[PDB]
Structure formats: C-alpha cells, structure tokens
Ligand binder design. Structure first.
Ligand SMILES: [Zn+2]
Ligand SMILES: [Zn+2]
Lengths: 4, 137, 136, 4
C-alpha cells in the first residue's frame, strides 16, 4: 500500500 | 461499556468499522488482520480502500491481497507507539493507558497541525502567484 | 481528561464534591478523609451533611467530628468491594477496572431496587391506613 | 454516622  | 472517544482502542470496535472491505477470507489484509494492526476503515469516493491507524493517524490506500497490514504500518509509520504495545489491552495499567492516550492526543494534534500547514502553504502559493502575474506587466 | 462517568473513581473528583462541608481541619471526617473512604457530598434541605459511597451507594448522615469515614463505611456496608481495593487507581489494570466498574453497575441497580421497595412499602402503609378508616 |  501507499500513502494518501 | 467503554467511552466513545476511547472505543478505537478496542480491536472489535475497529473490525466493526470495515463495511464493504474488498479484502476478505483468502487475503492477508482481512478486517481482522487490519484491526490487529490498528487500522479502521474510512473510505471515500476516489479512495474506497482507505484505512487509518487509530493511534498515529497514518493513512494508507491502494491495498493488495498479499499486504500484511502490520508490515505496511511499520514501513509507513515506524514511530507509531501502538506498534510497540505488546500487551493485551485489558492487561494494561491505567497509567500505561492514560500515558498512551496522551500520545495519541499529541499525534492527533500533529496531523491536524501538519494539515493546516499544507493548506496554508498552498494558499500562500496562490497569493504569491497572483501578485507575480500582476508585476508581469 | 477522564470520561465523566468514571470520575468518582478518582479521589480528587470526590473531594471536589464537598462544598460547604461542615467538618474541616481539626475533624476526622474531613473531605479528604471522606473521599478516601469513597464518599461524595450530596446534601439536601433536611439532611445537609448527607454523603454517599460512590461504589456501593450507601448513604450516611448525622456525621460527627470524630467519625472516621472508613470505620463508618465498614460498619454500614461491609460488603462494599471498594473497601477491598488496596491498589492505587493508576496501578489498576483495565481488566480489574472493568470488573470493578461492572460491580458498581450492579450495586446501583440493587440500590435503585431497594429504593423502589422502600417507596412501595410507604405507599402500602398509606393504603392500609386509608382502608381501615374507610371501614370504621 | 446515622443512616438516611
Ligand atoms: Zn499507527
Ligand atoms: Zn461503599
């Protein structure tokens, strides 16, 4: 997953 | 029961927040495995898999079935104190808990403050440009 | 801060409830010594020294300067579990604390119940008295 | 102390  | 603002400290509360979570049974990032990591579901239109640490307020989207929520949390917010709590919840002393609740309070402050900063920097950019385009003539 | 519902567990909250408490400095039942016993001040017109265990809800009035609040509490409600907590609040666990708060909840109902009973009985005395006069 |  990645960051907003 | 337990108070409203302190609910998210309860795993079963956190699980309960996953409604229409795409990643289920066969996946590594099930609601259960997610809540265990500290996440709660907080979806939007353009980011429907959006999730958040209840403790450090780190926000992650773009999940994949083989994502281990704890591993992803450690990578993105290594400073998160909840990551360090090895005890079961009810095994915590009130002091230990209150000490923790205060770090969260601070964590929350920081995120909001950091936000207000970004917003303000953005506004400062617009205003500056308007002025520049005026002195371009 | 702490959720309000939980505040009476805190000595410093209980002390704060004593406003116009007659028994001060030289006395054995000071607000401090009272809060340590579990009481909170809850005065009325005809019972201005009224106090109450926050845990077992035992109510005591007619205090005297040499009254040791812990001794008075043990005599009147020996069953009170708070009387048995030897540990300091922050030293407790949530588990322990959650169990304690539960026993509170029950005591409160049982008290609500015992009250309902007493009010019942008072009505019935009025009811009997009224029927006897109506028969004579 | 007396009881209520
Ligand atoms: Zn976190
Ligand atoms: Zn009591």
């Amino acid at each position: 997953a990645k960051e907003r | 029961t337990l108070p409203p603002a302190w609910q998210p400290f309860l795993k079963d509360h956190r699980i309960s927040t996953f409604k229409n979570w795409p990643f289920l049974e066969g996946c590594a990032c099930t609601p259960e495995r997610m809540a265990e990591a500290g996440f709660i579901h907080c979806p939007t239109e353009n980011e429907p898999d959006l999730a958040q640490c209840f403790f450090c307020f780190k926000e992650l989207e773009g999940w994949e079935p083989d994502d281990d929520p704890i591993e992803e949390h450690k990578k993105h917010s290594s400073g998160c104190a909840f990551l360090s709590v090895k005890k079961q919840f009810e095994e915590l002393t009130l002091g230990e808990f209150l000490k923790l609740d205060r770090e969260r309070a601070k964590n929350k402050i920081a995120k909001e403050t950091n936000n207000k900063k970004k917003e303000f920097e953005e506004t400062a950019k617009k205003v500056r440009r308007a002025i520049e385009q005026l002195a371009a003539m």
